[model samples]
Target: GPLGSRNPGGLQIGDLVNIDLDLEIVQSLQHGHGGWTDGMFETLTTTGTVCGIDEDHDIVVQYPSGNRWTFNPAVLTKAQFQVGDLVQVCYDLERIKLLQRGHGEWAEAMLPTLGKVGRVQQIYSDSDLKVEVCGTSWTYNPAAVSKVASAGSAISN
Candidate 1:
């Protein structure tokens, strides 16, 4: 829609990008309140530094938590960017969760009587995960759940 209407294929290392937070996006996040793994959406926007570029041509953004996300430029709504430019971005956490399907299992909080081990059955949204553990399926907020190395093991979240 602007001079930088080109697809975000030209991005380079050490650039700055911003995640766009429009009203609709904010409302969408509000509607999915409970399932947010973290306050990623509540932060108004995510402005980060581009740390590296992957061989897949994906952009690797470095976050404050030291977690780097290497994602396609198309994942961003506004890809035309410059160094130190904080532009709004477009990303769908729901989509990300769907990709994690069939990948791993999560164990609910440990208890004396029983320890529940659940598989990631379905991911309805970024904030929601359907985990089937102990012969029962439960819906949980992703932010509240932590991963464990194994069931009945004293592993930290």
Candidate 2:
């Protein structure tokens, strides 16, 4: 479900890049549709199982959509996250760039793209408001984080 330059040789002028999209809609984005800020409020989801060791260290999560990410322990701490928390990390996708290695096909296939990552996990903090995704926790700073939304108890049918 990924688009854009899939070719390993090189990127053509009109390469059709595909961007992953979600079904869920945010109230704010809905209101901005057709406007300059449309789709700005929509929410995205990313997830992965706990990989690597370092119960307290930042672990890697292999996203279901074929992407790898680290919690960035320097920015996140256990105090900000718990053992099993679904977290929705807010970050600007435009600021990140892919840093792949090799040349030729490998270089062509990985030309440092920019995008944001998001997910759901269980996490919480005591004083400063910081949360981490459960299992593979990544600490975040409160000052760096804007707001925290708490999901009510799980509802089962």
Candidate 3:
């Protein structure tokens, strides 16, 4: 509680203000191995970039390397983020999988804590997203996963 705390109002939900990451805030929840579409499980070694995002709505990420595909909003979930702060992100590469191709269907990747660390770049009222990772970005929202931020050793450790 170094920066002080404020109440998240119910009426002015649409209004978004940036906040900083409070390292002192210990991680409380981390859930959801998550789900992906049907065909998503079929692809492999696909790389993508974030073109545009809805800012609490939908994010547009383009996979240019292998499939040249874009995983739209439905495929994206918001990662929990503080109002205006940053954190290191680490995910498990093995968690990624191809999903069946059905509306509302989900393909998920396991969130590996090892060697998974990135700088949190943007924050919305509901979700916060990372800026970029090793040249590729997740074009994903912060609300998708169960746990938002974690303070752990980098993959190199």
Candidate 4:
């Protein structure tokens, strides 16, 4: 959140730390002047289980291959987190429609499919999302999607 770390307190050792992949958080990561790349604004999501945390809330999460990443916990969602939960990242169908040509990677043909619930399979990047709907997998832009809800009970906004 704060361009990485500014404090290292507020997280517990072994506390589960999940990256809040919501549209606002990813957009915040792109602040500051820098060279732009293709699909730079493409929303991305990352997850890691906390291995250790400092007093300043700076958390150290253990990723695959024993890799650890440190960052602020402010970017995490307030939702009650747990393992084996079905979470669906819902998209704004109307918003996705407006971004057709202006935003790369968003296909206009997918318009009709919007507003429907899709199971989140994998997050390819900040700007790209891979979801399984009905049975097919499709990639969607981050901006085109927003809220995340439980899939078991409901997957709509």
User: Pick by TM-score: which candidate is best?
Assistant: 1
Ranking by lDDT: 4, 1, 3, 2
Clashes of 1: 6
Ranking by TM-score: 1, 4, 3, 2
Q: Candidate 4 clash total?
A: 14
Residue 75 of model 2 has an lDDT of 17
Maximum-lDDT candidate:
4
- Put down candidate 2 lDDT per residue, 128-149, tens digits, no spaces: 2223332332334332233323
Against the true structure, what is each candidate's TM-score? 0.33, 0.23, 0.23, 0.32
* TM accuracy, model 1: 0.33
- What are the per-residue Cα lDDT tens digits for candidate 3 across 11-90? 13222222122212211110121223322321222223444444443333433212222332323222245433433332
Query: Model 1: runs farther than 4 Å from truth?
Result: 2-9, 21-44, 77-157
Q: Give the per-residue lDDT of model 4 (tens digit) for 38-150.
A: 22221123345667765554445653223344544555432222222233333454556555444345565554354444555666544455666446666655555544442
Off by over 4 Å in 2: 1-42, 46-88, 93-130, 150-157
Alpha-carbon shift of residue 104 in model 1 (angstroms): 36
- Report model 3's TM-score to 2 decimal places: 0.23
Please give the CA lDDT of all the candidate structures. 0.43, 0.29, 0.31, 0.46
lDDT, residue 89, candidate 2: 34
